Design a protein around this ligand. Structure first.
Ligand SMILES: CO[C@H]1/C=C/O[C@@]2(C)Oc3c(C)c(O)c4c(O)c(c(/C=N/N5CCN(C)CC5)c(O)c4c3C2=O)NC(=O)/C(C)=C\C=C\[C@H](C)[C@H](O)[C@@H](C)[C@@H](O)[C@@H](C)[C@H](OC(C)=O)[C@@H]1C
Ligand SMILES: Cc1cc2nc3c(=O)[nH]c(=O)nc-3n(C[C@H](O)[C@H](O)[C@H](O)COP(=O)(O)OP(=O)(O)OC[C@H]3O[C@@H](n4cnc5c(N)ncnc54)[C@H](O)[C@@H]3O)c2cc1C
Ligand SMILES: [Cl-]
Ligand SMILES: [Cl-]
Ligand SMILES: [Cl-]
Ligand SMILES: [Cl-]
Length: 474
């Protein structure tokens, strides 16, 4: 038997898979696809995920196989400027194909001692009070204390629990594909930049592979939800929205995605959880899809490992739903807003012209970039300091950076005084004493995910909030 079984080998499960191994947890990653899809779906990590990959040391290998981007135009394609006061030390956008992201997270989680069987497909599941049982299409039953569903929008775990997927259906179809075109490099760059003024969900991305990532709107609503668009369909759209089919020489793949904004009603059913697209689907606008799943897994693994190790507080697991569900709503909302700001109708365009006036304000631009990147995500932890709930940025200390002490996923107590000490939580929380000109407060208590639950200077006050998130002393 296992401690935790995850269902899904995407970036969400493999992040959860490694976040458990840090604490020694028997994890099994069940993945249906035998060969990982080369269909580059996403295109990179935003600021918070980059922060996340640094708190665990995986950032060096992400920058080797991607490149940084510091340009504006993420909110509804309102081309702007990258802000200059982002409250972070990783003020850029990383451009890594999801295939490489899946690869590095798997190679890391594998190297952390995590079974990942591919070709296994969960067909049924049921749970008692002592664990959860899992039936596969081949016939193997599996036992685990906790099962988490990280298996995409059409999640099988979600449907086997009765968790509803309420929201708005897909009403704006859009076509996408990686293909060559019979046109001069200048020919694309002069037409795209020209027509974009009216249609804002249209453009071309060369990724070096000689071929181009081209997205073009679609007419109507596809009923099949599984019918690949013919090249002729793809060509007619380019002509109807840009005037020239560009002559596609050949497609490597053609996809058709919608704008459905659904979100699971419950993130937890006793011993079964949901994370990633399995708990929330939404339009790709803003690049928050993959970043949302990584940070859901980054919210749960240390809580799930806190329970299997038998030191988690009472309602720790219940907060996974109570902290990550409001994030998906707000993200599902602005995607609804960004899609609206791209509508061709006279109304939406008028509101687009209005936002175009507002993003000229430095604080307004900073406010939206802080929202797409989710660096201003704040949990309700408890009354107190202005820092409670928010994540701590990479503070430059006397010796080294802050995100260098957080690799082993342990709770951190950054002290500037030397008169603090945890007694009875050494087994879970570390004690880092270092100076930082960036932290006006004397001390900060960080959860394994960087979110502050206490910031101050009194120890008797610290002795209150230590057990509420780290358990009773030894
Ligand atoms: C071709 O896509 C266009 C419109 C799609 O319309 C529409 C409805 O369908 C989309 C698809 C299919 C996406 O995959 C997408 C995406 O990954 C994304 C962001 C949101 N921003 C998006 O909105 C979208 C998006 C839409 O909103 N992800 C990112 O930005 C991240 C984390 C890294 C990407 C870095 C590349 C190398 C460039 O630096 C970026 C910054 C520019 O290339 C973009 C502005 C896009 O390219 C151009 C030429 O303008 C533009 C979104
Ligand atoms: C056109 C398009 C463009 C996108 N662009 C971006 C972007 O620019 N930036 C961004 O951040 N996000 C983007 N996304 C979203 C991104 O693809 C997802 O958010 C990302 O995959 C989330 O991680 P995941 O592991 O939960 O998803 P998934 O890849 O769907 O993980 C599901 C895995 O579990 C497997 N599985 C399914 N059922 C079972 C079962 N019963 N048993 C075992 N295994 C099962 C699946 O086969 C799959 O391998 C885009 C999506 C689309 C469709
Ligand atoms: Cl490693
Ligand atoms: Cl469902
Ligand atoms: Cl006008
Ligand atoms: Cl202005």
């Amino acid at each position: 038997m296992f401690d935790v079984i995850v269902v899904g080998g995407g970036p969400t499960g493999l992040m959860l898979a490694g976040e458990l191994r840090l604490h020694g947890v028997r994890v099994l990653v069940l993945e249906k696809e035998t060969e990982p899809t080369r269909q580059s779906r996403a295109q990179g990590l935003h600021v918070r995920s980059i922060e996340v990959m640094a708190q665990r040391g995986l950032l060096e290998r992400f920058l080797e196989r991607g490149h940084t981007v510091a340009v504006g135009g993420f909110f509804a394609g309102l081309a702007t400027s990258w802000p200059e006061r982002l409250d972070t030390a990783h003020s850029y956008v990383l451009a890594v194909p999801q295939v490489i992201t899946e690869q590095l997270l798997a190679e890391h989680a594998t190297a952390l001692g995590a079974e990942i069987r591919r070709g296994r497909a969960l067909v049924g599941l049921r749970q008692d009070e002592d664990g959860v049982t899992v039936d596969l299409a081949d016939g193997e039953q599996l036992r685990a204390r906790y099962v988490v569903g990280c298996d995409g929008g059409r999640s099988t775990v979600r449907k086997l629990l009765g968790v509803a997927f309420p929201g708005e259906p897909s009403r704006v179809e859009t076509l996408l594909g990686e293909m060559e075109m019979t046109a001069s490099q200048e020919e694309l760059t002069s037409v795209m930049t020209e027509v974009r003024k009216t249609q804002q969900r249209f453009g071309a991305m060369p990724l070096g592979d000689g071929v181009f990532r081209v997205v073009v709107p679609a007419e109507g609503v596809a009923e099949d939800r599984t019918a690949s668009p013919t090249l002729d369909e793809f060509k007619q759209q380019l002509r109807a929205h840009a005037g020239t089919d560009f002559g596609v020489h050949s497609p490597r793949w053609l996809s058709r995605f919608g704008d459905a904004t659904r979100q699971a009603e419950r993130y937890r059913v006793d011993r079964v959880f949901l994370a990633g697209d399995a708990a929330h689907i939404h339009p790709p606008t803003g690049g928050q899809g993959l970043n949302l799943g990584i940070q859901d897994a980054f919210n749960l693994g240390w809580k799930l490992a806190a329970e299997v190790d038998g030191w988690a507080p009472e309602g720790l697991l219940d907060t996974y739903h109570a902290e990550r569900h409001p994030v998906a709503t707000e993200v599902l909302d602005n995607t609804r807003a960004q899609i609206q700001l791209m509508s061709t109708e006279p109304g939406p365009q008028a509101v687009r012209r209005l936002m175009a006036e507002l993003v000229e304000f430095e604080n307004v631009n900073r406010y939206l970039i802080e929202k797409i990147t989710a660096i201003s995500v704040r949990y309700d932890v408890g009354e107190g300091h202005e820092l409670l709930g928010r994540r701590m940025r990479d503070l430059a200390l006397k010796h080294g950076r802050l995100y260098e002490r957080m690799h082993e996923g342990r709770g951190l107590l950054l002290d500037q005084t030397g008169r603090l000490s945890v007694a009875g939580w050494e087994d879970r929380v570390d004690h880092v004493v270092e100076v930082s000109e960036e932290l006006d407060v004397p001390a900060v208590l960080l959860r394994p995910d960087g979110h502050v639950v206490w910031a101050g200077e009194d120890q008797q006050e610290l002795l209150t909030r230590m057990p509420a998130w780290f358990g009773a002393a030894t």
